């Protein structure tokens, strides 16, 4: 029974998470540092799976194996709390998220049925340098934990977690960062998703949103109408020549937050260079030819579970948005217009970084889902959403 608020979570016990190097939910933390020492001998044997299941590292460069992972996630990954929509990460998106600079094949950790070889579980790690308050640490980011619906509630997820932990330890890394919609010991920060309608007619039709407080449909479409072209002078897609200045802009901008990525220039290229239907980045190049701002959002459609025939909910997720000369409000207004132009139905953003300064003004509505941020084997004070400067996939 996963908890979604900390009031529900503070009641229950965590048989697995109590055994792990994370702070207790009750804890107020005032120190900064590891919970347990770096290990100088690591278990060489994989952890034991239930009878009939085996480990398999997934080579995603094999298109057949990538399709197997795509299918596992398409049928069993995260749903909304009403079981009406399920994320539909594309194979090309999965390659973007799972093969960044430094990726390792043993960190694409699958579980297969022994007799049929069917893929029924997965978890992944990717390397990341993380800045947390006054410390920079090489960590991994853990994502795409998924157990087949037919295999749920058999304690397979703790085995997946211990096994990726072991495989990361073997590479000399003893901290991780991750996000989840559920409350576990112990969030370092809690963010909330907000939603900006772009195609309100379709969102109402699929019951992603509802005609609120009796306005007509006519009145709703006019309320959410956007200009057909952006307003900021010099806005254009990011190009190869912009990689260094985007890296420079992002690095200085992120210093004001307390949990942030520390990206090399090669990582900036990976995470921001535009790729159709995966990642969009637009820069502002001013009258002097200098790039002074940039906006970015990634593509994440969702299956409509009750009518899986009726196309899909096309959503854009705000990524990193850096402003030094264009007002952030204007930059995000342009982000909405570009997402509308590109055929997105909704534009999603969290309330982290400086996002609360524009959410209400740009007619975002508050969502029903939280996003909790976590660190593994790092005990530090929690922080408000506006100090979180990290966006995962």
């Amino acid at each position: 029974g996963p908890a979604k608020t900390m009031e529900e979570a503070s009641k229950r016990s965590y048989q697995f998470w109590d055994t792990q190097p994370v702070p207790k939910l009750g804890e107020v933390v005032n120190t900064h540092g590891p919970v347990e020492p770096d290990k100088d001998n690591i278990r060489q044997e994989p952890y034991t799976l239930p009878q009939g299941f085996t480990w398999d590292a997934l080579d995603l460069g094999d298109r057949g194996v990538l399709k197997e992972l795509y299918t596992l996630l398409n049928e069993n990954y995260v749903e909304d709390d009403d079981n009406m929509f399920r994320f539909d990460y594309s194979p090309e998106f999965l390659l973007w998220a799972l093969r960044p600079p430094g990726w390792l094949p043993q960190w694409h950790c699958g579980v297969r049925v022994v007799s049929s070889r069917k893929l029924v579980g997965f978890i992944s790690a990717i390397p990341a340098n993380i800045h947390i308050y006054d410390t920079e640490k090489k960590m991994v980011e853990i994502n795409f934990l998924c157990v087949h619906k037919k295999l749920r509630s058999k304690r397979v997820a703790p085995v997946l977690i211990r096994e990726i932990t072991r495989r990361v330890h073997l590479e000399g890394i003893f901290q991780a960062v991750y996000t989840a919609g559920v409350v576990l010991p112990k969030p370092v920060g809690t963010c909330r998703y907000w939603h900006r309608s772009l195609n309100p007619r379709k969102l109402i039709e699929v019951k992603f949103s509802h005609l609120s407080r009796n306005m007509t449909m006519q009145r709703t479409m006019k309320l959410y109408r956007l200009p057909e072209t952006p307003k900021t002078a010099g806005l254009r897609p990011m190009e190869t020549k912009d990689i260094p200045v985007v890296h420079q802009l992002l690095t200085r901008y992120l210093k004001q937050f307390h949990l942030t990525p520390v990206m090399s220039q090669e990582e900036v290229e990976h995470w921001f260079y535009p790729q159709e239907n995966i990642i969009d980045t637009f820069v502002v190049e001013n009258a002097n030819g200098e790039v002074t701002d940039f906006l970015s959002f990634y593509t994440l459609p969702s299956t409509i579970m009750n009518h899986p025939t009726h196309k899909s909910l096309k959503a854009a997720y705000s990524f990193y948005n850096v402003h030094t000369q264009t007002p952030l409000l204007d930059l995000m207004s342009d982000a909405l217009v570009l997402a509308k132009m590109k055929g997105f139905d909704v534009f999603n953003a969290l309330d982290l970084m400086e996002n609360k300064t524009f959410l209400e003004k740009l007619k975002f509505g508050i969502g029903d889902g939280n996003l909790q941020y976590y660190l593994y084997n790092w005990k530090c004070p929690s922080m408000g959403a506006e100090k979180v400067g990290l966006v995962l996939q």
Binding site: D80, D82, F85, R192, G365, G367, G369
Partner: peptide, 7 residues
């Protein structure tokens, strides 16, 4: 990560 929709 988390699938949210408008309240």
């Amino acid at each position: 990560x988390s699938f949210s929709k408008p309240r």
